[PDB]
């Protein structure tokens, strides 16, 4: 994907994702309940948008999702076994 | 002395630079009349929504934004003003703005940065903190943080010619996301997919979001 410069401080996850999707200028759409009451360590630096979103989501229990159109979503982290 | 009238079409954002160097961005379907005189730099927001940025730093006259509901007097401020049918909403990002409701102009209500307030001619209607540093529309985006679906689609419809609605059973569903304004059809489709809704679109200018059956 493309890259963007991010300067997102640590804090509650939901406002951080509002900031992320604006800094990346992306269509990001996901269920409100999924991100309520979670937190992020933030994201500061230049990153590919997909890698930056995964870093923002570290520790949250969520991962980024994408489909056939250029939009992004979020989902509970995939089981690995 | 300098005057001008401006308007933006549905779906249009416009950048103006006023005679003093103050920058104004007009959002969709907006109308602004400007009248500078010896007393004041007068902006009249007749319809819609605008962002004032880069205020002139050393003009001796105050900057006044008036709507039918009252006056916003700017002290070096960067701020958004949106006119609704029954109130005006101001959001301050830098500096401070004095709100003077038409029928209760004194004492002014001081809004500092990170504050948003709605008022009518009578006075304040709501007031809250905001973390935004600029309105999302001014960077070509809509941003929703748990916004009720009915209110989200009211906002999005401002950018489109046709009618956009949701079934009443859906009116409070919370919308979260960021949405580039470049393609509003994509916004509708993405929100409907996230909320597991059907998009009824039987005539070009009438779109209803409905429960999946």
């Amino acid at each position: 994907s493309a890259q963007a410069d991010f300067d997102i401080p640590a804090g509650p996850l939901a406002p951080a994702l509002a900031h992320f999707g604006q800094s990346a200028h992306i269509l990001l759409s996901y269920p409100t309940a999924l991100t309520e009451g979670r937190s992020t360590s933030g994201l500061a630096g230049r990153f590919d948008i997909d890698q930056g979103l995964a870093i923002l989501l570290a520790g949250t229990g969520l991962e980024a999702s994408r489909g056939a159109n250029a939009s992004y979503s979020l989902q509970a982290s995939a089981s690995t076994g | 002395d300098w005057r001008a009238d401006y308007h933006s079409r549905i779906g249009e954002q416009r950048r103006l630079t006023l005679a003093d160097g103050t920058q104004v961005q007009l959002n969709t379907d907006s109308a602004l009349n400007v009248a500078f005189d010896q007393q004041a730099r007068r902006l009249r927001l007749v319809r819609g929504e605008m962002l004032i940025t880069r205020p002139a730093l050393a003009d001796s006259r105050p900057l006044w934004v008036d709507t039918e509901h009252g006056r916003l007097e700017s002290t070096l401020a960067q701020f958004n003003v949106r006119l609704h049918g029954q109130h005006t909403q101001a959001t301050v990002y830098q500096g401070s703005v004095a709100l003077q409701p038409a029928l209760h102009a004194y004492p002014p209500i001081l809004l500092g940065a990170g504050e948003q307030a709605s008022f009518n001619q009578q006075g304040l209607l709501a007031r809250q903190a905001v973390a935004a540093v600029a309105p999302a529309w001014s960077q070509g985006m809509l941003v929703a943080q748990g916004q009720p679906l009915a209110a989200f689609i009211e906002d999005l419809a401002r950018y489109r010619r046709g009618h956009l609605a949701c079934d009443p059973a859906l009116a409070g569903l919370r919308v979260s996301g960021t949405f580039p304004l470049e393609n509003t059809d994509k916004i509708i489709a993405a929100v409907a997919e996230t909320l597991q809704l059907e998009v009824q679109h039987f005539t070009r200018y009438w779109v209803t979001l409905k429960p999946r059956m």
Side-chain angles (χ1 to χ4, degrees):
Chain A
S1 74
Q3 312 191 311
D5 293 308
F6 299 97
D7 191 1
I8 300 177
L13 180 59
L17 287 164
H19 185 165
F20 184 92
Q22 291 177 266
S23 295
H25 200 104
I26 55 168
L27 203 184
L28 171 63
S29 170
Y30 50 87
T32 300
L34 191 64
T35 57
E36 270 194 302
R38 300 198 197 231
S39 63
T40 180
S41 291
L43 183 69
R46 181 176 305 158
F47 295 98
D48 293 321
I49 288 167
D50 56 0
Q51 274 187 61
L53 184 50
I55 297 172
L56 191 74
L57 297 171
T60 62
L62 311 180
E63 65 178 48
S65 179
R66 320 197 47 192
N69 37 37
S71 49
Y72 300 73
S73 189
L74 299 184
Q75 61 194 354
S77 293
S79 46
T80 62
Chain B
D1 275 48
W2 174 78
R3 295 171 300 269
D5 297 336
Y6 306 101
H7 78 278
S8 51
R9 291 162 289 178
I10 295 171
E12 180 170 31
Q13 289 83 43
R14 291 192 65 184
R15 296 184 146 76
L16 322 172
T17 305
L18 307 187
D20 69 335
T22 298
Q23 297 183 334
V24 177
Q25 199 176 339
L26 288 184
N27 203 3
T28 181
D29 195 15
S30 294
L32 166 70
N33 302 341
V34 178
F36 286 8
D37 58 48
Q38 93 173 102
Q39 185 185 16
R41 290 171 291 153
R42 302 172 177 275
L43 277 63
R44 287 193 282 268
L45 176 69
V46 173
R47 183 180 172 90
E49 179 170 39
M50 66 181 175
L51 172 64
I52 284 74
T53 60
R54 207 182 74 180
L57 294 182
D59 192 292
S60 60
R61 310 154 282 184
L63 180 93
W64 290 344
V65 175
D66 278 48
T67 68
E68 165 173 348
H69 302 120
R71 170 169 298 156
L72 298 176
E73 175 170 72
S74 149
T75 294
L76 311 159
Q78 294 187 160
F79 62 110
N80 189 84
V81 187
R82 178 165 165 199
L83 173 68
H84 299 254
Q86 302 178 45
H87 66 270
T88 293
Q89 182 200 60
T91 311
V92 185
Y93 306 104
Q94 287 181 75
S96 72
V97 176
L99 151 70
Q100 304 173 16
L103 291 169
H104 196 168
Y106 188 85
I109 299 152
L110 297 333
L111 287 196
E115 296 205 274
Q116 174 177 81
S118 285
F119 63 100
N120 61 12
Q121 292 172 338
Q122 216 45 270
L124 198 61
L125 296 168
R127 186 187 190 147
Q128 53 273 311
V130 296
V133 298
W137 70 263
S138 66
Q139 296 158 2
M141 308 276 296
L142 298 187
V143 172
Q145 306 176 236
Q147 185 177 25
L149 182 58
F152 178 78
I153 69 187
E154 176 176 70
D155 196 44
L156 176 62
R158 287 196 291 151
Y159 299 90
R160 293 162 55 89
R161 176 175 288 177
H163 181 63
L164 183 60
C166 61
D167 271 356
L170 311 177
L173 284 175
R174 295 177 306 167
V175 179
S176 288
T178 59
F179 302 100
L181 283 165
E182 297 100 280
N183 186 322
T184 61
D185 283 351
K186 282 179 180 196
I187 302 178
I188 293 168
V191 170
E193 174 67 5
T194 295
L195 291 180
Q196 299 281 264
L197 307 177
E198 190 176 72
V199 180
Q200 257 196 10
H201 194 181
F202 301 151
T203 189
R204 181 166 297 275
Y205 293 116
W206 198 295
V207 177
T208 310
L209 274 39
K210 290 202 118 85
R212 264 183 206 168
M213 305 282 300

